[PDB]
Curated annotation (Swiss-Prot), chains A, B, C:
Name of protein: Vang-like protein 2
Keyword Transmembrane helix in record: yes
Cytoplasmic compartment residues: 61-70, 131-362
Part of the intact protein present: 109 to 515 of 521
Localisation per UniProt entry: Cell membrane
Gene name for this UniProt entry: VANGL2
Transmembrane segments: 1-21, 40-60, 71-91, 110-130
Native organism: Homo sapiens (Human)
Topological category with respect to the lipid bilayer: Multi-pass membrane protein
Coarse class of the protein's main subcellular location: membrane
Effect after changing residue 284 to S: In NTD; the mutation protein completely abrogates interaction with DVL1 compared to wild-type
Extracellular side: 22-39, 92-109
Entry keyword set: Cell membrane, Developmental protein, Disease variant, Membrane, Transmembrane, Transmembrane helix
Amino acid sequence: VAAGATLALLSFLTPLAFLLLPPLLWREELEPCGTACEGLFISVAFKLLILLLGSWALFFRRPKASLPRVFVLRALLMVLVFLLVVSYWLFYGVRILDARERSYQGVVQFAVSLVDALLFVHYLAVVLLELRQLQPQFTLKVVRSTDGASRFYNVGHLSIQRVAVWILEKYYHDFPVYNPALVIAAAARRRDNSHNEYYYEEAEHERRVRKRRARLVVAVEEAFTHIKRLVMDPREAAQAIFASMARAMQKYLRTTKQQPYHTMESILQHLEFCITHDMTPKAFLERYLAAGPTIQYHKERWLAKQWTLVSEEPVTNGLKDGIVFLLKRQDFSLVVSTKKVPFFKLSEEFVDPKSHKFVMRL
Amino acid sequence: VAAGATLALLSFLTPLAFLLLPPLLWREELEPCGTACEGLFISVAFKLLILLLGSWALFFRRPKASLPRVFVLRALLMVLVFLLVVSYWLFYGVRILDARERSYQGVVQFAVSLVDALLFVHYLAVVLLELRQLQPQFTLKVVRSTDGASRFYNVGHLSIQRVAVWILEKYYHDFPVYNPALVIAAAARRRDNSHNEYYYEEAEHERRVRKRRARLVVAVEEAFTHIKRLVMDPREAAQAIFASMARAMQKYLRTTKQQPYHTMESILQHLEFCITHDMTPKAFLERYLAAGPTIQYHKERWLAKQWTLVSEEPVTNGLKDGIVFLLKRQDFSLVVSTKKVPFFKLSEEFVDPKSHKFVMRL
Amino acid sequence: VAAGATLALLSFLTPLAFLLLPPLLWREELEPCGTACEGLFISVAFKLLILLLGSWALFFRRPKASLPRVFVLRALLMVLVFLLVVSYWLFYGVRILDARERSYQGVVQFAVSLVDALLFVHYLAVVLLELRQLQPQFTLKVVRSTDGASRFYNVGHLSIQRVAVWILEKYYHDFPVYNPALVIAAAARRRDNSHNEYYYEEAEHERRVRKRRARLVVAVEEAFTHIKRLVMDPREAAQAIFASMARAMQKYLRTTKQQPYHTMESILQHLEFCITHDMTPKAFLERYLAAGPTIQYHKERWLAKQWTLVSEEPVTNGLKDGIVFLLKRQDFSLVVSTKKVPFFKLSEEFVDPKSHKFVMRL
């Protein structure tokens, strides 16, 4: 960041320094030039403005993740910007500044080429960091090692660590939140021929969950009917309608193992939120009936600063068919399996929309 | 649009005017130049062609939405194009046109710098309007205020109104279609200790929906068996097989509260569509068994021109953690809650794929 | 590819040839020039480096699909690169090479304009091939003609064949894998008034599937408890724990019609995979309990080289509202229906967050 910000500042200041050093250090010795110089000054002004606006739009933002190894392409871009600026300064010093270049059109064109090169480096930074991974090259199966919640994704050419950050950005809203509260063949044959206890326990659990869900739906409908939109603030109204639903809410959160996700304070805040935004009882209960993804919950359950990238291959090398890597937290892990999206061979077949003719039997 | 199209036309015509005014108004007074002029003419030709092709590809398309406030970045881009063109014209007039610039190489280089600056403005327009929001910065919980249908999305740096249009583009194919047809603690305790009427009503409704679904599946299988692919048109065949399924279809649409979504005319059109495209009875019933999203239905149920953006913050300012805003229609509303995607700190751990060694017990 | 690679190589070599032919064929006749030449050499060096890096990042990759007709925009780009290079060579030959141009600054500026034009052609290639379809213009309903598995997508301005490849890239991880093993009004009335055989058969099938699923969950829990992480390799451990679950796995794959998807060898490989990556019994069974998408399976079931694009309209023309086309394989087909994303008219409404005041009754 500090090095990157310094490189950006020096890159933006370099054309202006190139254009100001001759008119300041040697103005009389400098050879006067016509209108091409001023036209190039205007072009430099607008191209520096374009460069600053684009840099703000894409690159004046905080790093979104702390990668385990160096950001390979962004390091290459910093090196390229640095080599460009340093080489331009070297040449400028040794052949313009030292020689006290009388031809000012040459210096102005050198600064113009610098600004063009910086806009092209910005374009290259966009191509490397944003566009190389638009075309989906690979499909990733991401599975939690505990409950098997699986999603498949398409991803372009990213390094394994950038792919890891990408999958983490997807995880906090795609998978449900992690709820930890949720001879040999002869032994298998003896088990299979026993009472199917798990089947009936699962059926009973689903039945009691449906019963508690019904109780909760009725309780929340009654609770929201206990107030009118129209004196009383939305917080006071949430607190007044929470009493007629606190027991059913608590019992449903207990039967579905959702106690630590939803405190009384968070449920009151969400009641206030809903009744403020005209949300019906069902738009209130959508948060509590289903498991819901990780970002939906409190920030102390995210623990985004505690991801470990376990990769058999070095993480700076991009994906290829078969790369498996783990994203481990303290409790679960995300197993990511890579499969290259297969080569497609489309053929074109033409059918006449009038050629569809049908008959009675079968 | 009109102002934007005028700016685009003037920007494309400005280099050509710069290159044609000297050879027309003062050709004898103009100083002849060598081959660099013609090389720059060829470069201007190909760069104007590139500019026109890119403008067609991205910016010669109709506005996709009517935002409540000004499009901030596109207004900035129009202002930038206008300032660039107007300043180039001012300088050209006062130092080339008025002075009758004899050096034609300078004028050609000025036009070249203009074309470069327009290509760079096009690049900046792409960066501002398309690329600033590629990197997912925020996660949006979008919930219908009526039935609680919720989806989470990742979105980059967009203003709240552009985020609203984005969420609307997502809504018509993500959420199911809106079907409107679908002391105090002592009172809550008395209710919870009563007959769980909602549970048994829900079970009975699901049972009768499954029964009507089974009747409909059988009816549609029989109906499609009542015709063969092979005289009779697909429309006549749809009308001939609709009789053997009209009652079951109507009864299933009534039990699932889907009467106004599917008219006899639309069902006949979809029968014709399916039997034209070799779609099986199940590929036919996929439209009718599930609720389905909004765009699947008739255009009079979209009402895309009737969205209201209710935001506590001004809608030209981009998203930040905690921005809640409503997208209200006549009936329901989309509550959108923003949460910044958290900062990730990946660590790298290496495991030896050969180091996995297991033992018998537990 | 061969023509494209040749065009790329010639385009990269053309500036260097332009800069080397005068200093080699006529060095004495060549007019010496100052430092502007060397500054432009450095700019050419860094801009050719930028061009090569961007071309590698985006365009040095194998074609991802075999389209039925010509890639219209990529053909336009090849034609544009070719016309640019050929016209630059024509002018260079006839006015620099033949005339033995003494002014070397002109030749260097011509090469600089060439490199700028190639970077701008690269930018135009990005705009045409990657950016024109970022803005979602259309919504596509993709439905399998057999089981009606449907997904809606947003897609920008792509041709119908590029849209087809896009939908295929989505299909192998979005839809479940294709499992083929899964007067007239008076006749309809007689059928509807008969025993609802399909309802009870469906209920019985779901019940026995739940029973086999419970047996399989218990069997896999026991199997994974039959080993400890800690001598025995993960393959030997998978083979040792497969015996206590092989029967339940086979019976569940038979009741859900999943025999050909999962061989004993693939199940052993996946057991080894899971027990290697600390995946619990449920993270193991996530692959077998649900249908799962196509890419999850063996590569002989993908058959990506056997897609047929059946389109009523020519496939080189982009999408518009109402374009329906088929993606046919040997067994099923993907019906794709296009609907233009509707024009949105947002309005802004302001509500005071303090103005929310509620009252007791109803």
